[PDB]
């Protein structure tokens, strides 16, 4: 329900609008942003960024913001149009339960 359009080779922002009804902290939650091929983009494991699986193409090009919960991606391409997802997990002692998911779509001038 959130479509983003960007001018040619412009910068892109992917938010996923977590309500946070319980007022939890980033240290008890993990966040994944993934593309339509399921390859990961970025990860905040217990609050510290991890880059153990980001594909080289996405390495470094992405940045995170704490208060805004938004992923800032640079260097757009015509072939980078597609869908992206913000899968949020709550890391309880027993397991991880998915407590948020928000689909977004981005396209480029052609």
């Amino acid at each position: 329900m959130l479509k983003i359009q960007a001018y040619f080779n412009e910068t892109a922002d992917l938010p996923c609008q977590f309500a946070n009804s319980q007022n939890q902290s980033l240290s008890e939650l993990v966040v994944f942003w993934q593309d339509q091929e399921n390859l990961v983009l970025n990860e905040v494991y217990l609050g510290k960024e991890k880059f153990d699986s980001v594909h080289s193409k996405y390495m470094g090009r992405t940045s995170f913001d704490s208060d805004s919960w938004t992923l800032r991606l640079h260097n757009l391409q015509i072939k980078d149009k597609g869908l992206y997802q913000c899968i949020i997990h709550h890391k309880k002692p027993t397991g991880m339960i998915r407590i948020h998911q928000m689909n977004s779509e981005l396209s480029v001038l052609a």
Binding site: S21, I87, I97
Partner: protein, 196 residues
């Protein structure tokens, strides 16, 4: 709109899917392994289907639907995908769901999980998952899917419908291993033999 027919066998289908990621070994579909029993009598829809090594017991509260049929298949890396075909949708109310997965071969045990999944994709419905045993590594449940539910679109005589409104789909998930999101993808060597 008020009533469902209460027929013998339904020509008209719908969809709702889920996938269980188990750690013991499954190679390929056996063409006749699954066996399912359905019920509606209590005002709540219910389906218990016993398959490769576990029985899945799913229930919908305040439903106005009854599980017409189901299908089950096995993919890559020990995943088990079960599609569930319900009669027809009369209203949009975002029912709750209760699913129990009981391991009946190679990892039996007593209860190891009894929490509830919030599902804040819209934050209207909650599913209660109970797992007996240790033969689970992922659980995903997609209600009102928009993907291509139909396996071999379509069986000889039946007709099949699928939701196309994003506002009604819901996703419930729980994982014990590390970052297994999107636990499995549909169109693969999945054989999808009918569940009966």
């Amino acid at each position: 709109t008020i009533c469902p027919p209460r027929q013998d066998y339904r020509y008209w289908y719908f969809a709702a899917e889920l996938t269980i990621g188990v750690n013991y070994d499954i190679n390929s579909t056996i063409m006749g392994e699954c066996h399912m029993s359905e019920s509606y009598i209590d005002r709540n829809a219910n389906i218990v289907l016993t398959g490769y090594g576990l029985e899945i017991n799913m229930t919908i509260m305040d439903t106005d639907q009854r599980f017409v049929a189901a299908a089950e298949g096995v993919g890559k890396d020990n995943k088990l995908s079960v599609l569930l075909f319900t009669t027809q949708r009369l209203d949009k109310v975002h029912h709750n769901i209760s699913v129990t997965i009981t391991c009946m071969e190679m990892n039996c045990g007593t209860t190891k999980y009894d929490s509830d999944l919030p599902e804040s994709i819209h934050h209207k419905s909650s599913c209660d998952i109970t797992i007996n045993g240790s033969c689970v590594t992922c659980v995903n449940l997609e209600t009102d899917p928009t993907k291509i539910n139909p396996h071999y679109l379509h069986p000889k005589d039946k007709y099949l419908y699928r939701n196309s409104e994003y506002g009604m789909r819901g996703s419930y998930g729980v994982t014990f291993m590390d970052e297994l999101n999107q636990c499995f993808l549909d169109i693969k060597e999945v054989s999808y033999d009918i569940c009966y």
